[PDB]
Amino acid sequence: NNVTLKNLTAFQLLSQRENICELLNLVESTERHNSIINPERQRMSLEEMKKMLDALKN
Amino acid sequence: MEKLESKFTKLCDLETQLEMEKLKYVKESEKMLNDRLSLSKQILDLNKSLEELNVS
Amino acid sequence: VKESEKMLNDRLSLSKQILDLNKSLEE
Amino acid sequence: NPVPVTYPTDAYIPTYLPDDKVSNLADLKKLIEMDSRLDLYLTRRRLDTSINLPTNDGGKVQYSPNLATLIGMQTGSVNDAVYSIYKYILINNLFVTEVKLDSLLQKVLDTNAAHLPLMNVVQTVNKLVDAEDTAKLREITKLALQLNSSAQKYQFFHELSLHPRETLTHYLWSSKQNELVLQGDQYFNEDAARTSDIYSSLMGNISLLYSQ
C-alpha cells in the first residue's frame, strides 16, 4: 500500500504512455505476452479440462 | 473450477455429518420412550402396592 | 423435542408429588 | 467488525467486453454465482443448532439433597441443572407479568424473601453445585485484476478507434498536465535547498509569512 499523489500521477502517465507508444508500434512487449497465451498454460490447462470433463461423467 | 471442488468436498463431508446427527435422534428418543413406558409400569405397581397399605 | 418436553414436565411434576406424598408419613 | 487487510480481497470482473467476441464469460459469471451459493450453505451449517442434552472429571456434578427435589435427578452436568431449574420457574407460572418465589424454592434457596430476581436465582444455582483458502483467494483475485487490466487496455484502444480525435487531444492534455505535477517537488531535496541557488515564488512567500 502507501500510495501518494506522486506515486499515483506517475502511474497514470506510465499507463497512458505504455498505450500511446504502442499505437506508434515503438514498444515491443513480447516478453509480457509470453506469460499469458504463449506459455503451456494455454495447452496444459486444456489438457486438464480434457480429463476433468471425463471425470465428471461418472 | 478448482475452488469449486474444494468447497464441494466440504459438502461431501457435511452430508455424512448431518446423517450421523440424524442417526443420533432415533437411538436417543426411543430410549426416552422406553424409559417412560417402564416408568408408567412401575408407577402403576408402586401406586397399587401403596394403596394396598393403609397410607394412600 | 416434542417427546423430551413431555418427559421433562412429567418428571418435574412427579417430584412435586413425591415430596408431599412423603409428607404423609403419619399413617 | 471485519479486520482491514493490506491486499485486495476481490475484483469487480468487468463486463464492458463485447459478449459476441469473447466467449464463456457468462460461464464465469455462472460459476462465481454458484460458488456464492455453495458457501451460503456452509456458513449456515456452521451456525447449526443441536438439541442433544435436555436431560440425557468435572462435567458431572453431585446435586444436594435439597435441589434434588426441583430436578428429579441427583447427578448430571451443570447445564441440566440450570435448564431444569429454569423449566421449574417457567411451568409453575412464577414470573411477575401482571421472580415470585414458591414454597419449595424457599428451602432450595435458603431465603425467606419470597421474591428474587432470576439473576440471583442462577447465582444460587452456581452456589449449590483453513490456510490454503487464503492463497486460493489471493491467486484468483490476482487474475481478476490482470483481466481487469487487459480489459482496460481493450477499452482504451477501442475508444481510440472510435473518436481518435477526441482521445488524442485528451492524451496530449493529460501529458501536458501530469508532467507538471511530477516536476513540482524537485525544488526541496536538501542539496539544492542550502546552496543559495533557489533563494535568489519563494520571495513573495516570505512577504505573506512575515505579514502572517
- In 3-state terms, what secondary structure has residue D61? strand
Cβ atoms of B33 and C3 closer than 8 Å: yes
> Which residues from chain C sit within 8 angstroms of residue D56, using beta carbons?
none
- Rounded to the nearest angstrom, the gap between the alpha carbon of residue D142 and the centroid of all alpha carbons in its chain is 21
Cβ atoms of B8 and D38 closer than 8 Å: yes
Chains that touch D (3 or more CB pairs under 8 A): A, B, C
CA dihedral of residues A13, A19, A21, A27 (deg, nearest 10): 120
How far is Cα D84 from Cα D67, in angstroms, rounded to an integer? 10
Give which of C12, C13, C14 to mutate to test D binding, by max D Cβ within 10 Å: C12
DSSP class per residue in D132-169: HHHHHHHHHTTTHHHHHHHHHHHHHHHHHHSSHHHHHH
Cβ atoms of D38 and B11 closer than 8 Å: yes
**What is the sign of the dihedral through the CA atoms of C4, C6, C12 and C18?**
negative
The minimal CB distance from D153 to the residues A9, A13, A19 is found for A19
Cβ atoms of D49 and C1 closer than 8 Å: no
Count of beta carbons in the 10 Å neighbourhood of residue D38: 16
Buried-exposed string D40-66: b where 16+ CB fall within 10 A, e elsewhere: eeeeeeeeeeeeeebbeeeeeeebeee
Phi, psi of D100, deg, nearest 5? -65, 120
Q: Which three cell numbers stand for residue D82?
A: 440450570
Q: How many domains does chain A have?
A: 1
Q: What is the CA radius of gyration of chain C?
A: 12
Cβ atoms of D84 and D71 closer than 8 Å: yes
Cβ atoms of C2 and B25 closer than 8 Å: no
Q: Which three cell numbers stand for residue D143?
A: 487474475
Instruction: Kindly provide the resolution of this structure in angstroms, with one decimal.
Output: 15.0
Cβ atoms of D171 and A16 closer than 8 Å: yes
D positions 82-101 inside 8 Å of A (CB): none
Tell me which residue of C9, A11, D63 sits closest to B36, measured CA to CA.
C9
Method: cryo-EM
Q: Which three cell numbers stand for residue D165?
A: 480525435
Q: Which three cell numbers stand for residue D78?
A: 451443570
β-partners of residue D115 are D100
On the CB side of C17, how many CA atoms lie within 13 Å of its CA? 9
Burial of D31 (0-12, 13-18, 19+ CB in 10 A): middle
In the chain, the amino acid numbered D148 is: N
Cβ atoms of D87 and D125 closer than 8 Å: no
Q: Which three cell numbers stand for residue B37?
A: 413406558
Cβ atoms of D34 and B4 closer than 8 Å: yes
Q: What is the CA radius of gyration of chain A?
A: 20
Give B7 to chain D, closest Cα distance, Å. 7
Q: Which residues contact D154 (CB under 8 A, 6 or more apart)?
A: D17
The minimal CB distance from C9 to the residues D70, D91, D104 is found for D91
Cβ atoms of D126 and D136 closer than 8 Å: no
CA dihedral of residues D197, D199, D202, D204 (deg, nearest 10): -140
The minimal CB distance from D6 to the residues A1, A12, A13 is found for A1
Phi, psi of D61, deg, nearest 5? -130, 140
Q: Which three cell numbers stand for residue D163?
A: 473518436
Q: Which three cell numbers stand for residue A50?
A: 480434457
How far is Cα D9 from Cα D12, in angstroms, rounded to an integer? 11
Q: What angle do CA D35, D40, D44 make, to 5 degrees?
A: 150
Q: Which domain holds residue A46?
A: 1-58
In the chain, the amino acid numbered D185 is: D
